[PDB]
Write an enzyme that holds these catalytic residues in place. Structure first.
Site, PDB file in Angstrom:
ATOM      1  N   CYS A   1       0.802  -1.227   0.000  1.00 54.25           N
ATOM      2  CA  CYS A   1       0.000   0.000   0.000  1.00 54.25           C
ATOM      3  C   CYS A   1       0.833   1.274   0.000  1.00 54.25           C
ATOM      4  CB  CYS A   1      -0.957   0.036   1.198  1.00 54.25           C
ATOM      5  SG  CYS A   1      -2.160   1.383   1.212  1.00 54.25           S
TER       6      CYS A   1
ATOM      7  N   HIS B   1      -1.673  11.070   4.686  1.00 50.07           N
ATOM      8  CA  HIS B   1      -2.186   9.787   4.225  1.00 50.07           C
ATOM      9  C   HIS B   1      -3.708   9.790   4.225  1.00 50.07           C
ATOM     10  CE1 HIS B   1      -1.436   5.694   3.043  1.00 50.07           C
ATOM     11  NE2 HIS B   1      -2.197   5.212   4.006  1.00 50.07           N
TER      12      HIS B   1
ATOM     13  N   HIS C   1      -9.460   5.162  -1.927  1.00 49.17           N
ATOM     14  CA  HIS C   1      -8.103   4.707  -1.620  1.00 49.17           C
ATOM     15  C   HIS C   1      -7.598   3.734  -2.671  1.00 49.17           C
ATOM     16  CE1 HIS C   1      -5.154   2.886   1.579  1.00 49.17           C
ATOM     17  NE2 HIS C   1      -4.538   3.375   0.519  1.00 49.17           N
TER      18      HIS C   1
END
Lengths: 1105, 67
Positions: free
Chosen positions: A161, A293, A331
């Protein structure tokens, strides 16, 4: 080492085809998460209905990248979209991709999924080998290296990720340390397998609402999204567009944590932030925006924002802005970092920070937000100016952080050359691409750097991109020109016209270009000691200025030399040079045989020597008589001087003889035109006295001759003695002979190879007609200038454009002052302007290819692809077509055998429709199809009730003879009248059929109903239903009869595609014949036999009272 | 500041465990994710440096050595 800059960028992001759409959504607030049923049925296994889903995954320009059709199908969608995105990114920064071929550029791709590979290796018995060379993780970057020919590393990180930002950091380190000159860092992520989403759901990382409410109390978890992004990292010395400068980038891992591997640690993030900024030498007060983030978790957000607060808000008074692109687009797991980078860079380009969605009240566990130290951009804010920071933290523990310095380049100050027209050249796969680039350039004609970048990327080989076009900007009479490019290299030739071409005020339009004026000034220097200056003549305003022979010759030669100088700037080396006698001096220049000073002095001395010698007036006139015929026709003392062409042959001599010849021709009626040269007959025996003084002068002028290139073709000496001593090297003798001996221009023109690209290098394209007739038919004249034209610069640029449309590559940037780089901020993005050839539709794996009979949902809703079924209304109620079942069975059998329907001829046998299914006005009806391959039998069921039964199997040996139309029992020779579409459907309505527009396909039908024409569209169901309608039309029985059985149906798609013939319109049609004697309905590549229809009672709904 | 560079070109265990949508356990991803071939080592040994799982085929191990 050396500075590292973000030079280009491209990518496809949720609900946005290009970065332009991504920005339009970011500013406009359009949420890019949706509740569609694209990847899989919403609500499956309890997953959230929302997700970030790309608009399409089936478009790929296989032919451009050299992927055969079979390999393209098996290639991963991520790989295809990434190849396209990478090419778009490289050309985004003005870099032609070929300039990087063979160098040490590297490819770092962050990918964390191989769903397609798992899907393609499900069946061991039928799996194809090349599935591995297109679905492996390694090929995700190795394919890019192979196509683009990068010799640097080819790595595919995973890093759980944080792959995109980790790849960016590795590329930054490589460019910093000098291992690589540039890098292509990409991030890819596609949602195809629902089981992965179910896993993430079980871990608790996702949110039930599919909203990443980052920085908010209601934060629960992120919503998975998709995205393919590519960036081009290059050292400053090689870049053109600079989005920002990577001051420093680093990576560290959380190490050991008590709570678990998946629990983020804020201390490690704080340490990473502090180390990189300190190492780069920056001060925390400089930072203006930090791209957090921002997943939106109850635990992650406090850790990350507390880390940023303890790291950067230690001693700064003014607040620090915070943002997270995940509030908008969800995301993208591996591609998350690059999406944030795209957001930041676009915001910097437009001078605004995109608002963050789903933020109303702050998290009470973050002191900063409640206080004023840390602020979130909930409405657009102008960019005051400062450094930026991006942090991407994977759930495994890997942390990446990069510091960016925005590019602050003021727009260039106005310059004199701004007003001058600039030429733009574009190349593309389809005419749409060329037109898009031309229109975008037109909207920004005042953007010099943008136009230069466009002109840089357009020099792509014609084979790869067969469409080209040019658009001269800034000109009043301007417009795009678009035409297809023939393949194969074409010779480039030159022509230098004679002494006729001359006008008052030539070269002023071109005097504005620096190269041309410099060449003219050098010529003036060459002629200055004699007593005249070419520029003085050019700037002059007298009509008689150029009627002096010496002035004419000097100016003409100087202008031709200037034109050649301009041509040599763009990189054009002629493959052949041929000129008229004044012209050859210039032709001598073209080959390097004559130096500029030598050529100019030679022109002046020719003019003078002609001046000094006094001869009786002699008029040279071109007459429309053949060279051989003029040989005898020419009166004694008059000779054919110039052999212009077969039709016209110039003749010169004494004024009285030439006038007598003109009068004689007028008596005959032939074309006898007299040119004006001040009573001078060139290339005639009269000049024979001039040579001696000219011989001496030229012997003085040209000191050491040089060899004549094979490209030059002398027209002064016939081709026989082209190996003689006289024409072995240019010298005084050669020029003198040219001035004396007759011109043989027509003789040389034959030597021009077919398909050549000729250039008429002269102030006036006088020989345009001569070249258009004499030269072979398929050659292009391409004249550089025109007489009395208001702005010759526009004409010259248009000529260069016509060179561009012929295949030869010339760069118009060399004709203007260079544009300093990096380009000023705000230079428009180039990646969106590129468009491809997306006519084909390649396979993308479905959600039912992974582990969990075939079931089909018939949704008649507006958006559903099965909407056309709403036109099959019989008795006033919508029913599923009988042929609709056959399509379902065909698709199921095709999926079973592994082929596609277009590649699978099928044979149905003994089909029985047991009951009719009514399609509800709202909702769906689910049909299951079950096969018994051993018995070659199929059953279609609906809620446990049998609907259709029969036998289906592949046709081993299709025979096209089966679809030859049987001879009709009734000759019908007269054919006076035929039923139109309206009439056939009026009759069907009267019987009780209410077919809507989609199911109306019978363009015409014979009165007997035994023949007609069936319209063809992409739909098989409509075609076969129209065949059944043709069967019904001729029947005498009244009432609506519906199919109940069929004995045999054959479908051979190949013969079908061969049988279709287009009508005068764009519509594709198939002829139909119904044989009631033989019980066959044959149309196109379909063959229905033994149809049976039973009367159905009228619904007697009697809605009309 | 130690780092882990692991060369892996296979995720068969990920496919087998995630075949049943109605019985797949959440922590199958932690132990079967490709990136976990290095993050788990860093977590256990407390290594604070890089943790990357390369994917170049037939050369992932030596590419990791080079890195």
């Amino acid at each position: 080492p050396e500075e590292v800059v973000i030079a280009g960028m491209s990518g496809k992001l949720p609900e946005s085809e290009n970065l332009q759409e991504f920005w339009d959504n970011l500013i406009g607030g359009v949420d890019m998460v949706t509740d569609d049923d694209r990847r899989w049925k919403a609500g499956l296994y309890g997953l959230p209905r929302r997700s970030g889903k790309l608009k399409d995954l089936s478009r790929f320009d296989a032919s451009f990248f050299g992927v055969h059709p079979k390999q393209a199908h098996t290639m991963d969608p991520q790989l295809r979209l990434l190849l396209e995105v990478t090419y778009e990114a490289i050309v985004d920064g003005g870099i032609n991709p070929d300039s990087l071929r063979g160098t040490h550029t590297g490819v770092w791709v962050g990918v964390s999924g191989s769903e397609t590979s798992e899907a393609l290796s499900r069946d061991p018995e039928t799996l194809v080998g090349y599935s591995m060379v297109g679905c492996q993780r390694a090929m995700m970057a190795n394919r890019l290296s192979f196509f683009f020919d990068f010799r640097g590393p080819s790595i595919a990180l995973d890093t759980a990720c944080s792959s995109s930002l980790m790849a960016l950091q590795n590329a930054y380190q490589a460019i910093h340390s000098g291992q690589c000159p540039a890098a292509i860092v990409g991030g890819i992520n596609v949602l195809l397998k629902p089981n992965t989403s179910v896993q993430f759901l079980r871990l608790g990382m996702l949110s039930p609402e599919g909203t990443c409410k980052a920085f908010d109390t209601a934060g629960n978890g992120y919503c998975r999204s998709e995205g393919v992004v590519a960036v081009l990292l290059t050292k400053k010395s090689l870049a053109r567009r600079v989005y920002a400068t990577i001051l420093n980038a680093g990576t560290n891992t959380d190490g050991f944590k008590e709570q678990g591997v998946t629990f983020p640690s804020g201390d490690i993030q704080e340490q990473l932030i502090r180390s990189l900024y300190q190492s780069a030498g920056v001060a925390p007060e400089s930072f203006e925006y930090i791209e957090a983030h921002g997943t939106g978790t109850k635990v992650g957000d406090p850790q990350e924002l507390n880390g940023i607060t303890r790291a950067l808000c230690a001693t700064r008074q003014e607040p620090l802005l915070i943002g997270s692109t995940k509030s908008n687009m969800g995301h993208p797991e591996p591609a998350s970092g690059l999406a944030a980078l795209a957001k930041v860079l676009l915001s910097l380009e437009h001078g605004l920070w995109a608002p963050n969605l789903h933020f109303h009240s702050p998290n009470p566990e973050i002191p900063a937000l409640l206080d004023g130290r840390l602020q979130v951009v909930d409405q657009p804010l102008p960019v005051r100016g400062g450094n930026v920071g991006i942090n991407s933290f994977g759930f495994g523990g890997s942390n990446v952080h990069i510091i960016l310095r925005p590019n602050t380049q003021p727009p260039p100050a106005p310059a004199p050359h701004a007003t001058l027209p600039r030429l733009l050249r574009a190349s593309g796969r389809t005419p749409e691409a060329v037109q898009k680039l031309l229109e975008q350039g037109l909207r920004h004609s005042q953007d010099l750097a943008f136009l230069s970048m466009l002109n840089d990327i357009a020099a792509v080989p014609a084979t790869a991109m067969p469409f080209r076009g040019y658009a001269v900007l800034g000109g009043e009479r301007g417009g795009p020109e678009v035409q297809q490019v023939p393949a194969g290299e074409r010779p480039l030739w030159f022509i230098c016209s004679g002494m006729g071409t001359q006008w008052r005020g030539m070269g002023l339009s071109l005097m504005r270009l620096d190269r041309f004026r410099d060449s003219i000034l050098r010529s003036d220097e060459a002629v200055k000691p004699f007593g005249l200056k070419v520029s003085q003549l050019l700037l002059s305003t007298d009509e008689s200025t150029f009627d002096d022979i010496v002035h004419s010759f000097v100016s003409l030669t100087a202008i031709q030399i200037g034109l050649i100088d301009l041509l040599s700037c763009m990189g054009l080396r002629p493959d052949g040079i041929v000129g008229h006698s004044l012209g050859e001096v210039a032709c001598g220049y073209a080959d390097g045989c004559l130096s500029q000073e030598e050529a100019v002095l030679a022109a002046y001395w020719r003019g003078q020597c002609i001046k000094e010698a006094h001869l009786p007036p002699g008029a040279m006139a071109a007459v429309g008589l053949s060279w051989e015929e003029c040989k005898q026709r020419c009166p004694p003392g008059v000779v054919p001087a110039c052999h212009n062409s077969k039709d016209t042959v110039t003749i010169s001599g004494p004024q009285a003889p030439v006038f007598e010849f003109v009068e004689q021709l007028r008596k005959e009626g032939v074309f006898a035109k007299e040119v004006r040269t001040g009573g001078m007959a060139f290339h005639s025996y009269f000049m024979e006295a001039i040579a001696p003084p000219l011989l001496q002068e030229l012997k003085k002028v040209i000191r050491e001759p040089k060899p004549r290139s094979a490209r030059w073709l002398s027209t002064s000496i016939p081709e026989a003695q082209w190996h003689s001593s006289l024409a072995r090297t240019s010298s005084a003798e050669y020029n003198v002979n040219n001035l004396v001996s007759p011109v043989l221009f027509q003789e040389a023109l034959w030597h021009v190879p077919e398909h050549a690209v000729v250039l008429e290098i002269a102030p006036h394209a006088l020989l345009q007609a001569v070249l258009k007739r004499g030269l072979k038919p398929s050659c292009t004249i391409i004249p550089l200038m025109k007489k009395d034209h208001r702005d010759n610069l526009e004409f010259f640029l248009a000529g260069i454009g016509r060179l561009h449309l012929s295949g030869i590559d010339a760069n118009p940037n060399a004709l203007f002052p260079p544009v300093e780089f990096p380009a000023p901020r705000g230079t428009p993005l180039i990646s969106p302007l590129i468009k491809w050839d997306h006519s084909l539709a390649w396979d993308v794996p479905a959600a039912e290819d992974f582990p969990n009979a075939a079931i089909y949902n018939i949704d008649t809703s507006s958006e559903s692809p099965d909407h056309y079924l709403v036109d099959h209304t019989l008795d006033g109620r919508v029913l599923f077509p009988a042929t609709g079942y056959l399509s379902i069975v065909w698709k199921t059998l095709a999926r079973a055998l592994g082929l596609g329907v277009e590649q699978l001829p099928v044979v149905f046998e003994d089909v029985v429709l047991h009951q009719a299914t009514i399609l509800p006005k709202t909702g769906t009806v689910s049909l299951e199809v079950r096969l018994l391959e051993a018995s070659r039998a199929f059953e279609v069921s609906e809620n446990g009730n049998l609907v259709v039964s029969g036998k289906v199997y592949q046709w081993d040996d299709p025979d096209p003879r089966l679809f030859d139309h049987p001879e009709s029992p009734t000759p019908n020779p007269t054919e006076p009248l035929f039923l139109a579409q309206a009439e056939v459907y009026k009759e069907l309505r009267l019987r009780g059929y209410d077919y809507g527009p989609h199911f109306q396909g019978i363009l015409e039908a014979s009165l007997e109903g035994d023949s007609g024409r069936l319209l063809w569209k992409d739909n098989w169901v409509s075609f076969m239903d129209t065949m059944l309608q043709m069967s019904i039309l001729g029947s005498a029985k009244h009432g609506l009869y519906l199919p109940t059985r069929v004995t045999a149906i054959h479908i051979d798609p190949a013969t079908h595609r061969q049988k279709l013939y287009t009508l005068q319109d764009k519509a594709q049609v198939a002829d139909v014949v119904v044989s009631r004697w033989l019980r066959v309905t044959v149309a196109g590549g379909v063959h229905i036999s033994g149809l049976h229809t039973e009367s159905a009672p009228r619904r007697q709904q009697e809605q009309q009272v």
